[PDB]
């Protein structure tokens, strides 16, 4: 294995209707398990997975405060930024923050990271050593010194280094089933002819988990043709994903082509032919 515990926070200012929207979604690699939505009919931290249901009030209450406090600082933050940029309070802006920690295939801390973005762009990134910040703008520099004089990297590092890894562990456990279970790709090719002398071959991978997958169309030995149209992996809506690669072939030649499909839930790679 190799795992990650990561959160994504978003704050969007709402001019007319006061208080900015604050969303917060957490993940144990690829599986959302919690979320806070200050807009939701319940402004509280809720479980998004079922293995999370077996969690006591203490946790939910605590995490609810955390998200609430962040929402608060983020509201202060959005104000400050509106200032650094000399911006009207009548327009909307977005503050995003992503942070996560990763484990080694060997089960301990690997790397940790943290970043903020404003109006869609990088703003302040916590450095690799996890002891420093890189502003990306000059407003960001003010945020950068403010940050260092305050010692934020310090905190962030602790969390990132213990807390974060320690709980990832606990979550992997409570999600023993779901989380460590791989689902391979149902596979298949399809023919959709274009002209009198050529068709499209489409290699399909459906229902797989996790989402990392690799589809390749190669003809009789060598690799990658002139055109492999490859759609962004997508969600089926059930926990699994879908993906497909297409290539255009001259009729008759349809078996000169083979599609290879790679996926963790496959004891070994799979080859398809029309």
């Amino acid at each position: 294995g190799s795992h990650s515990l990561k959160y994504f926070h978003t704050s969007v200012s709402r001019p007319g209707r006061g208080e900015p929207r604050f969303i917060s979604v957490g993940y144990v690699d690829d599986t959302q398990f919690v979320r806070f939505d200050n807009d939701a009919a319940s402004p509280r931290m809720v479980p998004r997975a079922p293995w999370m249901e077996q969690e006591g009030s203490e946790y939910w209450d605590r995490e609810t405060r955390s998200a609430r406090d962040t929402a608060q600082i983020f509201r202060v933050n959005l104000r400050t930024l509106r200032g650094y940029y000399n911006q009207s309070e009548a327009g909307s802006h977005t503050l995003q923050w992503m942070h996560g920690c990763e484990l080694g295939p060997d089960g301990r801390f690997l790397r940790g990271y943290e970043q903020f973005a404003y109006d869609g762009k990088d703003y302040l990134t916590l450095n690799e050593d996890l002891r420093s910040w890189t502003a990306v703008d000059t407003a960001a520099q003010i945020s950068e010194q403010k940050s260092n004089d305050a010692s934020e990297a310090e905190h962030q590092r602790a969390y990132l280094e213990d807390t974060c890894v320690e709980w990832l562990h606990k979550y992997l456990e409570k999600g023993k089933e779901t989380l460590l279970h791989l689902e391979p790709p149902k596979t298949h090719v399809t023919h959709h002819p274009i002209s009198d002398h050529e068709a499209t071959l489409r290699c399909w991978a459906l229902g797989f988990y996790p989402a990392e997958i690799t589809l390749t169309w190669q003809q009789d030995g060598e690799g990658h043709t002139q055109d492999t149209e490859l759609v962004e992996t997508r969600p089926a809506g059930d926990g699994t994903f879908q993906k497909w690669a297409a290539v255009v072939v001259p009729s008759g030649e349809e078996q000169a082509y083979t599609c290879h499909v790679q996926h963790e839930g496959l004891p070994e790679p799979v080859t398809l032919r029309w």
Binding site: A67, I73, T80, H99, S143, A150, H155, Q156, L160, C164
Partner: peptide
Amino acid sequence: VTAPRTLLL
């Protein structure tokens, strides 16, 4: 758990 405290910018 999310991080206990966030950066003030």
